[PDB]
Design a binder for this molecule. Structure first.
Ligand SMILES: O=C(O)c1ccc(-c2ccccc2)cc1
Ligand SMILES: O=C(O)c1ccc(-c2ccccc2)cc1
Ligand SMILES: [Ca+2]
Ligand SMILES: [Ca+2]
Lengths: 113, 113, 103, 103
């Protein structure tokens, strides 16, 4: 799946591979929810399950800093942090897509069902 | 596949479904090369083949105008037109991704092999 | 030393009267304001105050869209960077945003 | 009536000395120039000349990246719109660009 993240690299013209993604959910403060790394295709499947993914405000943080530093590029953003309310009118499936540059990022959401 | 196009809609939070995509190749003027429509997932596979996709300058035109008009939205851009040299140092596979808004578009490329 | 600009990709206009909050990591509130008629927010800080460190610029996009009658995806366009004149620009759509920094 | 601005997302700077060509559909060349130190190109046209119609703004991004020693994907960031003050902004990366219009 109900939460998928896809990341692309604007500098290299590739997927952003092995980038850390942390998801938090807003507590009664940000409580850890799930995390993972992108695959060779830039995708991260299997973050969560239908049973774990409840209504709430979620924060997806993509660790852009480590990713650029590891490629020998200077990162401006510390991380790319997408915050949204999920499932408020019923369960949906979300894809969070992000395009990364050293001084910019773009992000969109696809919401289904 | 060697040329794939993926389109997303920033207004509706969905794939851009059934959007016309025309590809031209620069002639000895823009000669028609291939065209198609995006699927229910926003993707257009099967534009061309390894044997047809030669070196050249290619223009991918995404018909944003028809797409917005059909949804009852006012389009500013007539079309989103990505122009690139392909295969100059050998065959590669290209994915052209585009994110559409009425007054803006973002596009990136993923290049493999 | 720090300017924020916000643009609306759906209407093709500056995003007016948008709340912008800036935090510095000790998140200490650091500066805030509302966008002008041009989509720009000047006068956030001073050179004396704006020291190197890690800043978050949080733009209240949700309130913006809701005032226009459009249901938005995000709570805010939130933007986190290490410092060390900065213009932070945000381009808004209901289900998307892009941000950049020009230094 | 028509301004073009170009930003570099890799270096976090204005894109300086970039060629910009504007065409009007009869493609008739209509206006052109090079970006200034601020990444902006003013003085392209006049209110008398800038009539409603379909315009292409073509930004010579390839030459820009090549001067910096970076191999670029695109030939140009080309941008096509129906008119009817316009600022057309382009944010450049080697394998990507975003463009917007603020009217
Ligand atoms: O693989 C995808 O579905 C995909 C990933 C990223 C994008 C994207 C394009 C431009 C800006 C931001 C994101 C589009 C499609
Ligand atoms: O008017 C400006 O200064 C400006 C316009 C657009 C952007 C921009 C931001 C994100 C994506 C594309 C363009 C930045 C600055
Ligand atoms: Ca609810
Ligand atoms: Ca060759």
């Amino acid at each position: 799946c109900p939460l998928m993240v896809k990341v692309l690299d604007a500098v290299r013209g590739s997927p952003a591979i092995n980038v850390a993604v942390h998801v938090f959910r807003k507590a009664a403060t940000w409580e850890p929810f799930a995390s993972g790394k992108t695959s060779e295709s830039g995708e991260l499947h299997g973050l969560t399950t239908e049973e774990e993914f409840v209504e709430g405000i979620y924060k997806v943080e993509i660790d852009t800093k480590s990713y650029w530093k590891a490629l020998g590029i200077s990162p401006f953003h510390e991380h790319a942090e997408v915050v949204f309310t999920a499932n408020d009118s019923g369960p949906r499936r979300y894809t969070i897509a992000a395009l990364l540059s050293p001084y910019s990022y773009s992000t969109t959401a696809v919401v289904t069902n």
